C-alpha cells in the first residue's frame, strides 16, 4: 500500500495506545503490533496493526533501534503526525 500521513490527537494524560515491535536491530521496521481500544491511535481511525512507522513528526525512524524509536515516539505531544506504510 501507499505511504499515508495520519494525524493523532494525544492529551497529555494519555498514551498513544499502540504496541510496538521491530526496529533496526531486528532488521525490520518499527511496527504496530496492537491498537488499543478507545485510545488516540484507535480513535484517529488511520493506524492499523501491521503498519510500519516510517517517521513521526518528521523524525525518520526507518533506521533506528527499538528503544530509541520508542523513546522518540513517547516524547511526542498534542497533534502528532505519523508517516506509515502497509507494504
Amino acid at each position: 500500500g501507499p505511504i499515508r500521513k495520519v494525524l493523532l490527537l494525544k492529551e497529555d494524560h494519555e498514551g498513544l495506545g499502540i504496541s510496538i515491535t521491530g526496529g533496526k536491530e531486528h532488521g525490520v521496521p518499527i511496527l504496530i503490533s496492537e491498537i488499543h481500544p478507545g485510545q488516540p491511535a484507535d480513535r484517529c481511525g488511520g493506524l492499523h496493526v501491521g503498519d510500519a512507522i516510517l517517521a513521526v513528526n518528521g523524525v525518520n525512524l526507518r533506521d533506528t533501534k527499538h528503544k530509541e524509536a520508542v523513546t522518540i515516539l513517547s516524547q511526542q505531544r498534542g497533534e502528532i503526525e505519523f508517516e506509515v506504510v502497509y507494504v
Binding site: 499502540i18 504496541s19 503490533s33 527499538h66
Partner: peptide, 5 residues
C-alpha cells in the same frame, strides 16, 4: 520485545 506507547 514489545513496547507500549
Amino acid at each position: 520485545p514489545t513496547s507500549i506507547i
